[model samples]
Target: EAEFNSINACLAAADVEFHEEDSEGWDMDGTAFNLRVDYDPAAIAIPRSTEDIAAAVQCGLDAGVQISAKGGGHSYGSYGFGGEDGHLMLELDRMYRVSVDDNNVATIQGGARLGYTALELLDQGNRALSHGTCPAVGVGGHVLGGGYGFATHTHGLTLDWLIGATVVLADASIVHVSETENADLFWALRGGGGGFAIVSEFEFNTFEAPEIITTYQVTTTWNRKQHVAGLKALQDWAQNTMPRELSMRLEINANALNWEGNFFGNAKDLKKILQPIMKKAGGKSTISKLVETDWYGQINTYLYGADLNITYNYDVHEYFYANSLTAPRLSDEAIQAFVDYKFDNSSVRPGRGWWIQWDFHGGKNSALAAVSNDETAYAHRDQLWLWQFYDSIYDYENNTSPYPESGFEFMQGFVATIEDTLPEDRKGKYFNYADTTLTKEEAQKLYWRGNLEKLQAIKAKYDPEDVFGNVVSVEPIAY
Candidate 1:
């Protein structure tokens, strides 16, 4: 194992595909220097079959080398996959397949990209359970990390719709897990972020695609002063009369700020449902070509460059950290503070980064808290409004070292300044969008709160040696 010859010889003996080229795109470590490293393990390309994955794991175990599973590799932190030093990557890029059955259940490969999955579901007149905007995000890491997107309010988290999955444990044992079978493993895999094992396939429940209308409007910075009232009006409408037939989300930022909205209804009814926001945020309105498509197309509007042909460049924006907080209500004072803070210091303005994405979560998600407190590690089960803080490495590349030092301090300061304004007893964070600053105690409180004991026990049972230790996995309960 100390020499490349030994590694190559072992891989050849096992008949695994071994590659020794530089991985140009695998940059989970945000540090510029730490992004690249040398490795000499077999590049095992896994197919849709769990047997192959199991064999690969057994091969690694026998060789006495650690293993790392790679899905889309779109994760922001090192939690996505392993580095070059000690682990051989179980790349699942070849396991991309999506199929819909007569019962409206969709079976997707763990390697299937969200964008591809959405396209297939659209053709079948069905929509996905969640809408992760990044086109390259895979079901393995995304669902396992509690995916968040446009459909979060209507459906539950991505794992909520996940009926079953097939995974290869650390011991190279293959298991089919679901609510009715291997229920403990099923619960852990639902919202627990990756690193424990290699999951090869997933089965999710599907929802009917809606024939709807979408609108994108932008009020120039000169008009924001006049647009403030309209923004408040739309907010009031959202709080009071947002219809179930109309799934809605809004984004307001100083950098090219605008109002992007969607209405999940027929052409005529959608227009009526959108009347309040349209009338209030009166600006250059460009309605989309109203067509009767499935829910996939409707949700696609929010995907990276769906209407604009823009996809996120994962190489540059390698690390995407997300944290969430609930607001009892959006007060005028808070709104004004946000406007001033974002507009005055926006990257578009002062050459820094800024984004404010607001989404609703009170439909089916409201009932998830009652399902099983000991089942999933997701802590933000019951929340009125979801506020995500998305900060990428691309934003901090300007000043290099100073950016990470100062930028993080600034972001932390901002959060601390407004900490008291958020809802009480409901302070929770999103698992997919985690940041390193969160203390271990804080992570447990915000991410695993009441489920710590159960998660630790499950972790001990499944991964006794802590082989899959990463930033986001079950740790021993502290008492």
Candidate 2:
């Protein structure tokens, strides 16, 4: 009873409106992609501005309670939930504001969803910024974790375009960070998870929207032997001379192998680039006619079957477990290991959906590799491919299915097989994916690599009290 009254007193003192655990709004901002874990916060507050955020943080501190910030709440792990229980959650959904300056620079509120921000930028100045493909992802969390998308190979990672940010610190202090001001903090913010502070706004340099873009989808069915051959062919094309304007992803499912990509040029040019791979895959694959569409149309059309509106209410939660790894080259042995796991493991049952996705890195993305790793917090610049293994149980309609424990075990074993086969230098992972299965040391190396020490130092300097923390967050260096 005392704890309940303390929560209410804190909310009242901060002048922040909040919902109790029984209210409908309680779980609205608490939703996440992976429903395996649950977080029960003491209360959820809807803050519309930085001042409100500061007040809420201060109130939580005064009440001796931890705090968490939820921006879009798309984390696969519950990293956005402050890790444990008895915390105050700041729901930033109501703070979606966007503005474009005369210099084609965009200043977007931290809570703005990518779908709305993209549409608003296009509407305001016919401009665009590199962002993740998921429409429901929040700008604050996405950019902070080094977001990548279709334009990544051509332009750069989402963090590369970031120029400034406004963050609310642990002590209720509001400060601006950028290249010219608080430069160390700026570097840490790029790829470091949001463990140091709560960002209220982000400023990015925008580019002129492409007049027209081409998208392609090529798919082929394959047996075990054919899968190996097709994957090798695909790897050769991806690593060897793929153009910078072309961004591609290869998906290997239970019965089929599919390659989907977007080209900055027209159909004729895209066809020429894809012809070699199609021939190598036995030329029997089904190909979709390349479509050329405007920037906004292309974005809206390929929204992963999501709604076109800015607001996304995920009515049902899907349970899934995912982990990622990076490789410099997809060797024949590595490809065979992947194929064998999918076929050999009887325990690896396909629940409703399971697949391994490989996203190519290189072309303009190599330019990021050329930069010093210490220059920024993002450390996976030299990787050739970012591969993800995803397994999900899709009983959302009934919500009565048992958890797929066997599938989860298979995923862990499969990851071990690939990691053992690959060379030491060829292994890495993306921070945005947020795999909680990793140990503390493994997570540290995968997310920051050799730059972990510097990031830890920054965390110690700014967040010594560990006011902001999560499962995958960088811990402050011990004194």
Candidate 3:
């Protein structure tokens, strides 16, 4: 009851929307991006400015309660809802404002989604910033946790280009972070997950938009053996031969393959660059086309797969289980096993829908690999490929059935099949695609192997009480 009073005082003081269990419009499940999460917050406070956020944090701290910021509420584990019940959640639904400075830096509020952020940056300064394709991904969560995109091969992770941020710490004191200002906090904020503090705004380095950007896709129907051959071919050339101008994800779904990507250069020569993979795999593409588009056109077309009409700030969610792994190119035996196991296990389980993808991460000229891991907390810098395994329990659009327990076994087996084969040094998971099933210890080990110790020390210093806590957040080191 005391916790409720403090939360209500904060919401009332901040003059924001409040959602409590007995409130007029209380829908805990509606705010979560992943339907699988069941953690319900004690209160949901939507702050519209830095002052509102600060007051809310201060009130939560005064009352000795856990406080978690819900930036866009897009966390795969639903950490925005405190990752577990009863924590105070700061929902930022009303706080999306974006602007670009004279120095070509984008200043986006914590709650803004990538789609609108991209559009606003383009419209305001005619500038470009590299980020993920899903337009609705929250800027704060995405950039704070090693955000990647088709632009990554050329530009680097969004975390790399981030210049500065204004964060409200657990004590409710606001501070600016950069190389010189709160240096350790800045390091953690760059690629370290959002356990340190709640970022109220971000200032990222942007670039002049290119007049023409090329987006391409090649779709083919391949037999099981051909899929194995194609995946192997990818490892052979993609690790060292593909140009930095290209970043691609090849997905296997419904017994067909799609290699979709954007190029920093012209479309006329993209095929020649892609020819090596086709030659090695010995396959025919049914629909292979590269179209040149304007800066925004490329983003819209990329999201829709094959170019047509598109929408922005697209609101969509589903019941799903997802996991990821980062490793050097697959060995022949593992690559073969990867393709063989899905069919043997009937991974689809007969909507029950599944897809597997390997995204290119390293090449001779790759920007992602060129950066020193010492520079930021992103742990997967040394990896060559990021493999994602996913299962959608229900008809995503139809929302027909509930997720089954067997779905867990399918994804676990899928990842373990590949992860088990890799040596210990190569085992790591991307934080963005949360494996909700892993224990806290398992998540800490796989998500931030080398960077964990430093991250823990920083957490201890900045948020010892874990006021900004979540299920998979880095823990503070004890004395």
Write one digit per residue (lDDT tens) for candidate 1, span 1-479: 22444544555565655444343433322212212212333344333468767766777677666677767766544454443345556667567778889888888887777777777877775555565776767678898877776555455578878899888888878888888987877887877666556788899898876555443333434354644565566566666666654455556555445444454546677656665566665544444344544555555555555331212233323323334554444666656655555555445324345465666654342333334545576655655455666544543335343344445654454443335565545566556655556665676566655665677777777767655555455664333
Instruction: Report how far residue 375 has shifted in candidate 3, in Å.
Output: 0.8
Clash pairs (backbone) in predicted model 3: none
lDDT of 2 by residue, 269-317 (tens): 8888789778876676877657987778678756877765465354435
Cα-lDDT of candidate 2: 0.77
Spell out the clash pairs found in candidate 1: 76-319, 76-320, 209-295, 305-310, 322-433, 347-352
Query: Is candidate 1 or 3 superior in TM-score?
Result: 3
Better of 1 and 2 by lDDT: 2
lDDT: which is higher, 2 or 3? Answer: 3
Q: Which portions of model 3 show Cα errors greater than 4 Å?
A: 1-6, 14-17, 22-25, 28-30, 304-315, 347-350, 396-404
Q: Rate the local accuracy (lDDT) of all candidates.
A: 0.59, 0.77, 0.78
In Å, residue 368's CA in model 3 sits off its true spot by 0.8
- What clash count does candidate 3 reach? 0
How many clashing pairs in candidate 2?
Answer: 0
